[PDB]
């Protein structure tokens, strides 16, 4: 089988965004929460790992102990001035150096560690240590610009791991498939004029960054044709996503011939996420991972790396990620999703489904069909 | 004069140890934070903001008086009420489909129901011009013999049958803009022409898989039930068009003597239990559409009854703009989500699909 | 008539992301539940229980009047107040020792203080016979220029100084039965004989390591400060003897024109921030001692001001019985812990020890 | 000090007592909690393991996979009828079959799992796979009677582990030192007429079971002299516990000559626990662990097993248990207890200290 590496560190759950009601700073008209503070909560990620323990799936993976990102690693993407300001704010108690990117004292070390998980997953897959990998990163990365953190991302996890890999393995072509429900503006920005990294984002139309769709932003200069935005209307679900993957994502991968596929895996397109309006369920994520596994076996020797990003529904994220992990490792457990049959009843009916198919066919046509 | 019907103990109702709406055990790990989905704070926080803004001081807050056994038995069989009380006395349970409650939840449900009775009664007797009943537990999914979907008693139907007994009211219209289908209201009045039941809801959401546009009543009630399913991901302009093209015309045709809104706030843009895109100004505007209809059709007699709403951070701003509109007051509250939620709204291609969807609903109505 | 002074926004003060009182970072993992130790609910649940019992119906609730900067500057230097406001605008912080606050904590601290000002004002003016101010943030650890121990303004000192300016009251006694030493009150009036400051507190608890029996005032204030430290693990009978043999005799000798009690409820038997064994009826009986003293010494003028109290589940029953005595009102509330808390009380050998300890304090007072 | 087994399972953190405010059942006058429900909360135990991970301590220990207790196991202590009703209620959604022992659907499986942690820890120490062991038990066990669960204890973890050891190794003499702040009434009861298990309990006088002190309850029959209660007054702290251990607990162990020492380790005597009134701090638990390590080394070839019981301060329990684990494993980390200085300042002064010493002097005198 594909021995799957699972990259996690306890301290990633000790990152805390501060006293917010969901994503809202307390202060003014926003009453502080009486329960868990924040939206990126520790349990919105730890509960996935908890469920993988309870099912026994965790014992079927290998869990290496990753070293943190070094300053040299992260400075292949970020300017040292950002990194120095980040560390100094963190040493002094935390803050927010960007757009909705709050952190607490010592958040700098936890982000370097989070980043180390994605570096390690990429490094170990390229070295053959494992056949494929899942990095349970927290804080996430796919919104972080070179000099600006945003949307709960403090470092550019996947870009940093890619740049390390080019330095240590000389890898020529990398494709990033971002199915976190929000646009991967960070990844898009960092490689926008580069043709060696193909950046694909599937995301809810206009959600985050608010108002942005991006299907005509396809790259610049040498990177023209190497960025691919797939916005999908709010309220799209399982059949829409798999059509998008069959008709856009997978052919673009086939065209590009990567030497490595990386999934920026947010789980926030799930049917009860507060931070988006999509209708994916656990089996959606199993099937999308299988398409990525098949593509990687066909294109780059099974070299597939999944890097956790967003996902905010503490009760349902575990089941979506666990089905993903089952696919990735080719293992099956006794876990049954208690929401699955309701999520299937919830899916768009025939009138909405023809609209999603019309919407995706136009994206295809607009790309040169 | 706006009356505001609330009682501290509606916040003491507790659905038990669920992760969101998932009963714990087997593969569901217990929540480390607040248990459940219908949490006390997902309703209390609206009242807290009405206090913090000074709005609540411009409203009249009468003391709650629970529904009686006689009140609730106008709708429910005595056997259900009896099993409910006995299960509650022995520590709680669930007598339906996703309707859990704890010890003493029976009395809290009778108290919650009483808020709706009194809101309707006081408006009909002109003690106040309109009214808002902060019900918890909610009511619009509860069937005559079966509680459902966090609804233990049929709050609005009980209030209506009380109104018929106490005031002899002839025509009532219920407009249910909670994001789930008002199956409880629909069923209880399905064969009656004196109560027009309107439900605007996310297509196929709860009850799961139900759309319902063809279900327009039976017998004497044929033509007096009106389901308006909207697709997941619909937002402000879709709801406005549905009210302009379906809901408000249906009211003008029916000529009610009282309008009740079953007001869930769970169509809000960050709610976990639906996929819709309404924001606080949506609720302000739909409330003004009901105020206008009430002034036009029944001397301004409007009652708003709280049902769902599960985003504890954003529900308060939606319901507070509703309350401003209802009271005709205007506070300093600024919705910190409004700009982003407006940015989130469906773009042209999605907006065209919503408009085509609603146009077809209108057409199907003959 | 008992006036009850409270405002929704006092429950919006947040101390930030701490596990209990431990700032997050380094080896302290963020809490998954409610953050902090001075949590909103550790105070709001007292108000909730008084609504649920009907007791709140029997009291008068004046609208809150925030403290003015002129009020607070009768105790604090203006520079402190300006730095406090600027730090709160910039998003909060901590300007003292264990006194964190979030953005907007300045306004809420000013509100909280206005509750104690008003409660004292309305009793002196005869609008109510006695009063309870549900202050949050608390006040009695705050120094003139240094906030401490969750206390951002010196609520009771400010209230006293407003009272001297508006009414010219001559003699005020403050009885501090919060379980921590009232070091703020002690320091502010230490060289003054017009305010007698008494503090009963767990030996060495907060400020840590302080006992203080020999600290009796200075200059004209000599003999007008009275510390009563009590060993960890003392309970109902120990406190009763301390009040009978020390506190009440000191009130008799002093002849106050007003009694104010700084009532933290953190000496209760399950509080995390102290080791004492008081129960709900302990607070009812200690309030009756203060009521009888006030009746006998100053025409029944008694103000109770909320300080600390951190056991969310049990603080409501302690404060509710206090309010019952304060108002002379009966409810059906029953403390479901009382029998157990009575069984937990120190046995005979410990009780002889507590009696010997208190006898020594009596003797040392000369 | 040694190669230390650490016995934990993720599902022990999935046991939920239900919708209580602290230990008070919601309903009537008790308002539901908005934060974490209950007193025995998952995090009041998990946070110890989380810190042992974050410190790197976990990487120096051995973590065997969990082996649940079998029904045969638990029925060496409990009548099968109790176990079957427990199973039937757990399947039907949970309940409470005793006194303050509530549980949710599937709580039976998790109690069987938790018990297995103690069984395996004892087994592995006796068979020599590890020199000492820590069992992160949840639910706890030391209040559970043979037919009556109580005080958040659904199975008699430590008794069941001792009877398994007897059945599998023939062990003659076991001492249990219960320093959980509450009386170990379950262990006392099960072994009350037996001379082969010396049961020692140090606890807050009159705390739980409420009103109970127990110094004069020394066993019966063949068990006379083989149960030892050390009630301590509420408000006792570090120096009182030290004296109790030097003057009573360690002398008892030396007379009894155990072949195995089991510590029932609740951490609820820490200085901020809601469910007791004691003033222990992290270094108290380190030193008490050293005392038991030295007794195990002198009396039974270092065979020492520490079984988690109570502990309810989710912010401070981790530092107390982490210093415990440092002593058990003999591994140092960079963990610094942020509360320690203050808790030292909190400790009883000279007048209360003299009361605690004469109290303990009185207990020693009554022994004989
Ligand atoms: C403004 C709220 C939108 C979510 C921001 C973080 C998105 C992500 O998880 O990638
Ligand atoms: C999604 C499963 C539960 C839905 C309950 C709907 C209750 C409401 O109308 O607020
Ligand atoms: C860090 C020690 C906690 C004690 C501070 C609380 C003060 C009070 O409630 O009066
Ligand atoms: C009711 C207060 C005490 C609860 C009993 C649990 C004691 C323990 O942790 O052993
Ligand atoms: K690119
Ligand atoms: K994306
Ligand atoms: K209804
Ligand atoms: K509806
Ligand atoms: K009808
Ligand atoms: K003071
Ligand atoms: K005091
Ligand atoms: K003085
Ligand atoms: K004990
Ligand atoms: K024995
Ligand atoms: Zn996302
Ligand atoms: Zn709803
Ligand atoms: Zn205090
Ligand atoms: Zn205990």
Numbering used by the authors:
A (entry chain C): 1 to 369
B (entry chain B), C (entry chain A): 3 to 368
D (entry chain D): 1 to 368
Q: What did the publication describing this PDB structure actually write?
A:
Classical Zn2+-dependent deac(et)ylases play fundamental regulatory roles in life and are well characterized in eukaryotes regarding their structures, substrates and physiological roles. Structurally, these enzymes are composed of a central eight-stranded parallel β-sheet flanked by α-helices on each site, known as the α/β-arginase/deacetylase fold. All active site residues were conserved, as shown by the multiple sequence alignment and the structural alignment, suggesting a general acid/base catalytic mechanism for the bacterial enzymes as described for the eukaryotic counterparts. These enzymes mediate catalysis using a penta-coordinated catalytic Zn2+ ion coordinated by two aspartates and a histidine (KpHdaH (1b): Asp181, Asp269, His183).
RwDmhA (1b) is a dimethoate amidohydrolase, i.e. the substrate specificity changed from acetylated lysine side chains to a small molecule phosphorothionate. For RwDmhA (1b) we identified an all-trans octanoic acid in the substrate binding tunnel coordinating the active site Zn2+ ion with its carboxylate moiety. We did neither supply the acetate nor the octanoic acid in the crystallization condition, which might therefore originate from protein production and the activity of the enzymes in E. coli. For RwDmhA (1b) and RsPrpH (1b) we discovered a hydrophobic 22-LFL-24/32-LYF-34 motif in the L1-loop lining the substrate binding tunnel, the sequence 98-GHLAP-102/107-GMLAP-111 as well as the sequence 342-MAEAW-346/352-MFALW−356 in the C-terminal α-helix lining the active site rim. These residues form a hydrophobic active site and contribute to the binding of the observed octanoic acid in RwDmhA (1b). Only for RwDmhA (1b) and RsPrpH (1b), which evolved toward non-protein substrates, the second proline is substituted for an Ala suggesting this position being important for substrate specificity to accommodate the product. For RwDmhA (1b), we discovered it being an active lysine deacylase, which might suggest that this 1b enzyme is capable to act as lysine deacylase additionally to the reported dimethoate hydrolase activity. For RwDmhA (1b), we identified an all-trans-octanoic acid in the crystal structure, suggesting RwDmhA (1b) being capable of releasing this fatty acid upon deacylation from their substrate. As a consequence, we propose RwDmhA (1b) having additional yet undefined substrates apart from dimethoate.
